[PDB]
Amino acid sequence: TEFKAGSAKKGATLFKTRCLQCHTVEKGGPHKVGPNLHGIFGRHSGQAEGYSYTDANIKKNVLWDENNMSEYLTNPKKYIPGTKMAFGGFKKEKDRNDLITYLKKATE
Template structure:
């Protein structure tokens, strides 16, 4: 099982309710508790300029794409042990499909 193109509108609602308290996604948006996610698809983990990442996130050295974001968002602490991201994850595959679809579209 893996990422399948989802509904960006539903993903936007998920972002607003589950992510926006810690992240922005618009170009030039500020870092909050978590980094700004604009351009996250295609970016190396731990590389957003001006954000103080955990050592675990930097050392993971993954190039974010739809599939590995989908896997990460199921259980961030399992995917990157030692991450400071407190989010427990989205267990439903369809929710992750929708969220990753939105993040990809919103961050280009």
């Protein structure tokens, strides 16, 4: 719709430098500050096992699809008030395009 693929290698690195601190993407990868992100697309928020998500994340019951992840990536707190995710966001659409590209390939 409003989602455009960019670079997976670029996105791989945005992840490492901006998301790796609190999340893993691999299947069998563990939860850390953040929950493991394997299989997140198609998935609704707050459903990873062994993970304690805020009341905020839970009740948002957001269906993770690439378009959705873009709004969130711009301003998670604005997008999900009450969330403990400590990420200020991606204001540049290319950044978001590029990371979603990566996530879409890495989390499947």
